[PDB]
Structure 1
Amino acid sequence: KPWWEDEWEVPRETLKLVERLGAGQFGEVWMGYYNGHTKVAVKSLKQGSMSPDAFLAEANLMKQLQHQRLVRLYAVVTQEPIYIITEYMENGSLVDFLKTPSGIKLTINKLLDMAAQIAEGMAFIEERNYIHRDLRAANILVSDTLSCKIADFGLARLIEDNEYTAREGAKFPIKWTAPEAINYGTFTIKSDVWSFGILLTEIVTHGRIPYPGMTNPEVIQNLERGYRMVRPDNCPEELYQLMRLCWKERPEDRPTFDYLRSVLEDFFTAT
């Protein structure tokens, strides 16, 4: 729909940007208010840093993917400077939150709860025929009630035919990305499943970098030998074995996110 018919379009005047949360090459992220009272996150595009079409493509995708477990699109301003306005998540990224004094005190029970919430979000994405491709604790946000939501849909894509193939030139974080995606650029929900396994290590280590003490070339070489990540300190063996399922060699052997959700809820209630 054009901007004058789009239910997400809001006049810029409805927004007051209050506190800057991040700034990068491509713009800024602000905590702000909509119509005086409603707290929102505002992501602004830095003119010229990247295509406005490419910028807004993330919002169009979020229009299609609405769920309690996914960070919700609130509004857009489609005239420069372009804003994507989303649900504000009071406890920030999961990776940061697990290091704070509150984060540090969380029991294994609560961490397992949070993991299940994430798999729940990812099971919705899976059901809808999407993939995320950037799944990692930095892209999970935490609410004031300590619930978790999937965030950052910049790389997320609808599939028609099982697979999205990236470019030859395209580069992805080695530690989080499935081997078939790094090697062939072929991404499926099963690649996201692999990333979820890595995300689990971040949860249980309170945000530590995966594959302790290893460079990227060492990670690639270890995996090719059939090794997987060494058991993190203080990881329940059950959870470790669940990570290993995520890291199966053949994508089709990796579990569904609905299975992962189910298992993690069992782990959580048993604890």
Structure 2
Amino acid sequence: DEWEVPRETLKLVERLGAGQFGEVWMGYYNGHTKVAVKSLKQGSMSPDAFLAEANLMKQLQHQRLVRLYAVVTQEPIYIITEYMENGSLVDFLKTPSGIKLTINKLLDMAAQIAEGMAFIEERNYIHRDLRAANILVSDTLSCKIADFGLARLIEDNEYTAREGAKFPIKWTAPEAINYGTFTIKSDVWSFGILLTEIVTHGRIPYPGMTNPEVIQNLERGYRMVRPDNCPEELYQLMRLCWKERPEDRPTFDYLRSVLEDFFTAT
């Protein structure tokens, strides 16, 4: 309730993004500070379900993660957060400004995302929706993890999603697709796919392959074909995130540590 602010301190300016559950507008809080304001599409989700995402953000604060600012608990409900001037990493990499980024800056950002994921890891949470579209970029070209709508605290060894839940096959770990089971090692797999999105400047994973073809090739033991122009060192780091047995995948602090080493070396 202490995160509450009167609706009048906010003035929306333009839509940033939208979703099944509402939209995200850019705005100003008390005139001088730019903020992102997420709104709920009355009917889509229950108010609690919506605000659940903000209560989770109250427990997870870090520079590498999109910061909760305020909430408006009266209809229409708002979740106010930190504004990231350059939008989604997936879209930005395709802009004139992003096409220009060298492999050295691409490695820096990958390491920045792993550092955010390392904190999520140490705090016993999972994101479950790790992909370039859910990484936001600031005006100083730093990255922050966003969209904690699927994030969950893990107390007992894993998290199992409800029976009807569907997930982005190209981005989701085999165990999560097959049995709905998620752990931080599932996010590690997603991160490896996220890395392919970085090096290709926003391209769809598994170029030319449909979802069923991806599933089949993964079951045979194949993994994503080496992305074009991808350093072999990074590709082999990508493969570690794609180990069949979840426990064989590395931790995020190891991922971050190796990526920083690739960054310093380039």
TM-score, normalised by the number of residues in structure 1: 0.97
Q: Secondary structure at the match of 2:164?
A: coil
Instruction: Tell me the distance in 2 between the aligned counterparts of 1:168 and 1:258.
Output: 32
- Report the Cα offset of residue 26 of structure 1: 1.9
* 1:223 paired to 2:218: yes
Deviation at 1:7, TM superposition (A): 2.3
Query: Could you report, residue by residue, the CA deviation over 1:217-267 in whole angstroms, capped at 9, with x for unpaired residues?
Result: 100000000000000000000000000000000000000000000000000
Q: CA deviation digits over 1:72-130, x for unaligned, max 9?
A: 00100000000000000000000000000010000000000000000000000000000
Secondary structure in 1 matching 2:108: helix
**Mean Cα displacement is larger for which, 105-114 or 43-52?**
43-52
Helix, strand or coil at the partner of 1:155 = coil
Find the residue that maps to 1:39 and give its secondary structure: strand
CA RMSD in angstroms comes to: 0.7
Deviations 1:155-211 (A, max 9, x none): 000000120011221110000000000001110000000000000000000000000
Which segments of 5 or more consecutive residues in structure 1 lack a partner in the other structure?
1-5
For residue 50 of structure 1, report the CA deviation from its aligned partner: 1.5
C-alpha displacement at 1:46, in angstroms? 1.6
Question: 216-225 or 162-171, which moves further after superposition?
Answer: 162-171
Report the TM-score, using the length of structure 2 for normalisation.
Answer: 0.99
Whole-Å separation in 1 of the counterparts to 2:202 and 2:79: 27
User: Quick one: distance in 2 between partners of 1:255 and 1:24?
Assistant: 32
Choose from 37, 41, 46 the match for 2:36. 41
* Structure-2 separation of matches of 1:113 and 1:26: 33
Counterpart residue number, 2:48: 53
Tell me: CA distance 1:201–1:57, structure 2 relative to 1, closer, same or farther (3 Å): same
Matches of 2:19 and 2:160, distance apart in 1: 27
Q: Is 1:139 the equivalent of 2:139? A: no
CA distance in 2, matches of 1:227, 1:157: 30
4+ aligned runs moved over 4 Å, structure 1: none
Q: Identity over aligned residues, as a percent?
A: 100
Cα deviation, residue 48, structure 1: 1.5
Alignment match of 1:21 (pick from 13, 16, 23): 16
Residues 1-271 of structure 1 correspond to what in structure 2 (within 5 A)? 6-271=1-266
Gaps of 5+ in 2: none
Q: Distance in 2 between matches of 1:24 and 1:263?
A: 35
Q: Cα distance 1:195–1:24, how it changes in 2: closer, same or farther (>3 A)? A: closer
Q: Secondary structure at the match of 1:18?
A: strand
